[PDB]
């Protein structure tokens, strides 16, 4: 299972000029292209060494596609002001996520196309890729207007064809970075708590991709209700980090083991203090 994904963002700023229009592209949840209307010489840029192997007609196209979408979003935001009878001097947000997940063979698994206004669901393309789920009366105006235009047919044409065919190519030309696995280096630290007990901290560092499970065991029992977790955080070099902690008494430290399970590990990792 792989995915191609585009996260688009338009933010207004009545009194600072035209809205800041943003696009970020992902393959398997990893960023590889990016667009920002505010950037000096604003244009579609590479965000990974493997996409840099694309010809110039590739970049001119997306820089022009992006800029064309920017022109529409500026209007949408104006359309979503009268839909809600909102003051013209308020800064508002319109987010858009489209993409296509592809099953192990290569044919389309799921196709995405939803919008969000000021952080809430606005409208979305259903799994049938035929019908729209709108969230409120204002989004129902959009829903009917797209049904008469035939939008989903044009929208599905992308998800089932070009979106799939270019994901199948991105995977073929950028495998060495995307499909690489970096095994997490693991280790445990020791911290005396003030209340007399001890906190053990078991770090999982510098690993790709992001999905990991971290657990502490006592005699085989997993200790989920006494574990303190941190969400996975990016090291900033493309790899990630994560630790888990438990509060164990003195002397009994070597009773507890930490079991690291990543996809870059054939067996899990076991560690004590």
């Amino acid at each position: 299972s792989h995915s191609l994904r585009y996260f688009v963002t338009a933010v207004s700023r009545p009194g600072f000029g035209e809205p800041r229009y943003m696009e970020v592209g992902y393959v398997d949840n990893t960023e590889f292209v990016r667009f920002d209307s505010d950037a000096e010489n604003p244009r579609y840029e590479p965000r990974a060494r493997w996409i840099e192997q694309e010809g110039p007609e590739y970049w001119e196209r997306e820089t022009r596609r992006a800029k064309g979408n920017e022109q529409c979003f500026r209007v949408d935001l104006r359309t979503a002001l009268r839909y809600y009878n909102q003051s013209a001097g308020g800064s508002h947000t319109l987010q858009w996520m489209a993409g296509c997940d592809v099953e192990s063979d290569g044919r389309l698994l799921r196709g995405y196309w939803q919008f969000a206004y000021d952080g809430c669901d606005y409208i979305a393309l259903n799994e049938d890729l035929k019908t729209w789920t709108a969230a409120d009366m204002a989004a129902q105006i959009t829903r009917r207007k797209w049904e008469q235009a035939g939008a989903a047919e044009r929208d599905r044409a992308y998800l089932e064809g070009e979106c799939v065919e270019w994901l199948r190519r991105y995977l073929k030309n950028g495998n060495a970075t995307l499909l690489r696995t970096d095994p997490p280096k693991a280790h445990v630290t020791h911290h005396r708590r003030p209340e007399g007990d001890v906190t053990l901290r078991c770090w999982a560092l510098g690993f790709y991709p992001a999905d990991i499970t971290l657990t502490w065991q006592l005699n085989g029992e997993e200790l989920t209700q006494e574990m303190e977790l941190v969400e996975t955080r990016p090291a900033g070099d493309g790899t990630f980090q994560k630790w888990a902690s438990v509060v164990v008494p003195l002397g009994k430290e070597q009773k507890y083991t930490c079991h690291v399970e990543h996809e870059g590990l054939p067996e899990p990792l076991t560690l004590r203090w």
Binding site: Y6, E23, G25, V33, Y58, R61, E62, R65, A66, G68, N69, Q71, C72, F73, A98, W113, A149, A151, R154, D155, Y158, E162, C163, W166
Partner: peptide, 6 residues
């Protein structure tokens, strides 16, 4: 590539 506007 990315999607477009109508």
């Amino acid at each position: 590539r990315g999607p477009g506007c109508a």
